[PDB]
Amino acid sequence: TYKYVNLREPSMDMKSVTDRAAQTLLWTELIRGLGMTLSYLFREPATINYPFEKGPLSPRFRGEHALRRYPSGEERCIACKLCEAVCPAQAITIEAEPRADGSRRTTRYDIDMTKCIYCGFCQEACPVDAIVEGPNFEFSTETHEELLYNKEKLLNNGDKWEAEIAANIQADYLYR
Amino acid sequence: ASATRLIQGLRNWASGRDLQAKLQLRYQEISKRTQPPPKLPVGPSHRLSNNYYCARDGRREAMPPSIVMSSQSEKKAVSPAPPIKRWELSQDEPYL
Amino acid sequence: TSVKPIFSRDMNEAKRRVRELYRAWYREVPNTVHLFQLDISVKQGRDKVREMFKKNAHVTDPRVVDLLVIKGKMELEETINVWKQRTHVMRFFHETEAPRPKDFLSKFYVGHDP
Amino acid sequence: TRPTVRPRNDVAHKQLSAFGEYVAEILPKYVQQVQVSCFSELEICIHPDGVIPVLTFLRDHSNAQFKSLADLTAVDIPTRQNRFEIVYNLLSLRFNSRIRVKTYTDELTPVESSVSVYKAANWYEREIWDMFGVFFANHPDLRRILTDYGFEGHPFRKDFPLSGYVELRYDDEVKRVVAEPVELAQEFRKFDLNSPWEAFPAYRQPPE
Amino acid sequence: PLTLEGIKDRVLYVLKLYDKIDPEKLSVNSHFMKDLGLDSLDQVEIIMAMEDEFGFEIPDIDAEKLMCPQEIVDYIADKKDV
Amino acid sequence: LLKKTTGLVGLAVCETPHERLKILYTKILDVLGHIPKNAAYRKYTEQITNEKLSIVKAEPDVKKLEEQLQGGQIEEVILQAENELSLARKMIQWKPWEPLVEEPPASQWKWPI
Numbered sequence: 001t002y003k004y005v006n007l008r009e010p011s012m013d014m015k016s017v018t019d020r021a022a023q024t025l026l027w028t029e030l031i032r033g034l035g036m037t038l039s040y041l042f043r044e045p046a047t048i049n050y051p052f053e054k055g056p057l058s059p060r061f062r063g064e065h066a067l068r069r070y071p072s073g074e075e076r077c078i079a080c081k082l083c084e085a086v087c088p089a090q091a092i093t094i095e096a097e098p099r100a101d102g103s104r105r106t107t108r109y110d111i112d113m114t115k116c117i118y119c120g121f122c123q124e125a126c127p128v129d130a131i132v133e134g135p136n137f138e139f140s141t142e143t144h145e146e147l148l149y150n151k152e153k154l155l156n157n158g159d160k161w162e163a164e165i166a167a168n169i170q171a172d173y174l175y176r
Numbered sequence: 177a178s179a180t181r182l183i184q185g186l187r188n189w190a191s192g193r194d195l196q197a198k199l200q201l202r203y204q205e206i207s208k209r210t211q212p213p214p215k216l217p218v219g220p221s222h223r224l225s226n227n228y229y230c231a232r233d234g235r236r237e238a239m240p241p242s243i244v245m246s247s248q249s250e251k252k253a254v255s256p257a258p259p260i261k262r263w264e265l266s267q268d269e270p271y272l
Numbered sequence: 273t274s275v276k277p278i279f280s281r282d283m284n285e286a287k288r289r290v291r292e293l294y295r296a297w298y299r300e301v302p303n304t305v306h307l308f309q310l311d312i313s314v315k316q317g318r319d320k321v322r323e324m325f326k327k328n329a330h331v332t333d334p335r336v337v338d339l340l341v342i343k344g345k346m347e348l349e350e351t352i353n354v355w356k357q358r359t360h361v362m363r364f365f366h367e368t369e370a371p372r373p374k375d376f377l378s379k380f381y382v383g384h385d386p
Numbered sequence: 387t388r389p390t391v392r393p394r395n396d397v398a399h400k401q402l403s404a405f406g407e408y409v410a411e412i413l414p415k416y417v418q419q420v421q422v423s424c425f426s427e428l429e430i431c432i433h434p435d436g437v438i439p440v441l442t443f444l445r446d447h448s449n450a451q452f453k454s455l456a457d458l459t460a461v462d463i464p465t466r467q468n469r470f471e472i473v474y475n476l477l478s479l480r481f482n483s484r485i486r487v488k489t490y491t492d493e494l495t496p497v498e499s500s501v502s503v504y505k506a507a508n509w510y511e512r513e514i515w516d517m518f519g520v521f522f523a524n525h526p527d528l529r530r531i532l533t534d535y536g537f538e539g540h541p542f543r544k545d546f547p548l549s550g551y552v553e554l555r556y557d558d559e560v561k562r563v564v565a566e567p568v569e570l571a572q573e574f575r576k577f578d579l580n581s582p583w584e585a586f587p588a589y590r591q592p593p594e
Numbered sequence: 595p596l597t598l599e600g601i602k603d604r605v606l607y608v609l610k611l612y613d614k615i616d617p618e619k620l621s622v623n624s625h626f627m628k629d630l631g632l633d634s635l636d637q638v639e640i641i642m643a644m645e646d647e648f649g650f651e652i653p654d655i656d657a658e659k660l661m662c663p664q665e666i667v668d669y670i671a672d673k674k675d676v
Numbered sequence: 677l678l679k680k681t682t683g684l685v686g687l688a689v690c691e692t693p694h695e696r697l698k699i700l701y702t703k704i705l706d707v708l709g710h711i712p713k714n715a716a717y718r719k720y721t722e723q724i725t726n727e728k729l730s731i732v733k734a735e736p737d738v739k740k741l742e743e744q745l746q747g748g749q750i751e752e753v754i755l756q757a758e759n760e761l762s763l764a765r766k767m768i769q770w771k772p773w774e775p776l777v778e779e780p781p782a783s784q785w786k787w788p789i
């Protein structure tokens with residue numbers, strides 16, 4: 001249940017001593033290393049052609065956040081504040097009131113994406129699949145406050161990415 | 177995979193290993209990106225009877241630490257456990 | 273009320289350690305102004321040392337001033353050896369901070385703090 | 387209670403209880419409590435004058451051989467008058483066991499440094515100084531190890547706030563990173579999460 | 595170290611280089627604490643100025659007992675031949 | 677048989693482990709006689725030292741001495757005998773068989789608070 005790395009006493013007969021002296025004087029392991037580097041010279045490189053090729057992702061991927069809707073246009077978030085209760089960065093800020101038809105909806109739904117640790121606890125805490133974390137990772141900004149998302153940005157991300165978000169949830173909801 | 181047999185033989189010679197049997201680039205041998213839907217199993221507490229929670233309550237069988245000595249014969253000297261058994265050398269590959 | 277001491281048995285040994293620490297800082301201040309190339313004068317840094325020592329001038333417990341001498345030696349050791357940068361040395365001189373309102377009336381004007 | 391309950395290790399519980407009796411009767415000058423947890427961990431609670439005898443005994447005794455200092459830790463408990471709880475996690479490689487040695491101090495009483503017993507302790511108790519303010523007497527190089535060089539206070543004390551008292555920014559006027567009093571654009575929202583109902587009746591403290 | 599009057603004049607020269615002490619009230623028997631009105635740290639840096647002038651390290655037990663310029667010149671004499 | 681290495685780095689191979697262990701065990705007992713008889717450290721360490729000394733005297737082999745001293749290599753058994761001797765010389769100075777120096781405060785080891 002254990003093995004000894006580097007507990008080999010070398011053979012001291014003239015054959016092995018001449019082997020090690022030929023290794024010293026004729027640089028045999030150095031030519032071995034040159035041969036291994038030369039072997040990688042003639043391989044096809046592992047380089048993908050970004051942006052025209054994309055790295056492989058799964059339907060579980062945790063990228064940009066989005067607020068979703070039912071298949072009626074009604075937004076799924078019913079202001080229950082589980083996602084900011086579980087948010088380990090406290091990146092989520094929610095206010096709420098009954099809207100004009102008496103429905104429990106949010107007035108504020110902020111996610112500071114620069115506090116956010118992208119761990120998907122909000123999408124697993126959400127009882128109505130409202131907040132999800134979409135597949136978008138190509139959303140670098142040029143200013144810090146463009147990453148301080150309010151509810152309108154998250155609803156636009158939901159409307160923007162729903163055709164993909166719904167298919168990824170369709171692929172992964174039986175594991176959840 | 178698309179390497180010609182001359183470059184493939186040169187590459188196998190300079191590495192010293194057969195490199196086509198173990199390629200580090202992935203091809204059609206990997207799993208399909210579209211999978212059938214699973215049917216996941218449930219745990220052993222998914223029962224309709226003999227399943228009272230107080231008979232499987234893990235958090236409530238934790239007890240406070242038993243105070244052995246407190247400040248409020250020819251008994252054998254003890255160790256914290258028996259001494260650790262000496263490890264046996266590997267039968268698989270000892271490097272001996 | 274029988275406590276284990278740190279270094280000083282009573283306040284006279286404690287003031288001896290305060291006094292030696294002050295001597296060490298007073299010797300060090302020209303070197304600190306030179307090699308950190310501070311924009312202060314040596315008299316100004318020495319006034320800051322005297323201000324930091326007069327800040328703790330109310331303490332009557334030997335263990336507390338033993339710890340004050342220990343932390344002052346740690347500050348000195350971080351300043352002699354160049355472990356602090358120029359910014360850490362100039363953080364004693366609150367230069368970018370606005371002057372706080374002192375009397376009742378200006379504190380009333382700006383806000384709710386007492 | 388088979389599939390979901392952690393199975394109790396009765397053999398190790400009995401062995402660690404017997405070894406706790408052993409340590410308590412070899413060193414009754416310092417040992418105050420000995421307790422074995424339900425998940426079979428042995429704590430020795432000692433008086434702080436016996437940091438060097440108890441740790442040197444556990445390091446050098448033929449039935450201990452706790453040659454490895456795993457971890458050294460303070461815990462701040464502000465309701466106790468000796469608020470700092472200095473925890474020694476020792477590892478025996480000979481007997482394949484672990485022991486916890488615990489002692490106490492307040493802000494002003496020093497604990498004797500244990501670098502003469504374990505050279506591992508050199509940075510650990512220096513971290514305890516940096517984070518809690520527990521001075522370790524007769525330490526080789528006791529100073530800060532983790533906080534910034536001009537840092538005031540000890541951050542892992544529980545009366546120290548989460549964001550501290552000062553914050554940094556670059557200031558272009560003085561060409562220098564400066565320290566200014568801390569102001570949050572969003573305050574850390576404190577959540578009172580504790581349930582008003584008792585969870586563990588076995589841990590119920592008796593009333594006054 | 596050569597003459598005692600030169601040592602006392604040089605002690606008074608160090609004390610008149612020190613800015614907080616009034617040179618009018620600065621005499622040989624002028625007490626630092628209760629006459630000149632000095633903090634203890636003022637006396638500590640006075641002793642350090644004396645060490646800078648006369649080139650020998652005055653310890654702590656015998657610098658606390660230096661409360662007038664005459665005590666300073668008596669201590670500098672007693673640590674020398676003169 | 678001349679063990680070539682102990683495997684532990686810095687642990688030199690002892691040429692005569694039996695005589696070294698006999699000297700160390702009798703020296704532990706000589707030092708340990710200076711402790712009072714009611715001290716449990718004296719009784720426990722005399723007990724395990726007499727057991728180890730009986731095992732050392734009763735086995736001429738070194739490998740079987742390793743398997744029944746049950747303490748790893750024989751050179752680290754020698755090292756632990758040295759550590760026990762140094763510990764006993766420190767325990768004479770500490771006198772830890774004395775009564776408890778101080779009771780703790782009343783809720784010092786009470787968890788949770």
Ligand code: SF4
Pocket residue numbers: 083086087088089090091092111115116117118119120121122123133
């Ligand atoms: S992914 Fe995590 S850190 Fe980000 S908003 Fe959701 S819960 Fe908060």
Ligand code: SF4
Pocket residue numbers: 076077078079080081082083084094122125126127128129130131
């Ligand atoms: S957990 Fe879901 S429904 Fe609840 S407040 Fe958050 S996004 Fe809205």
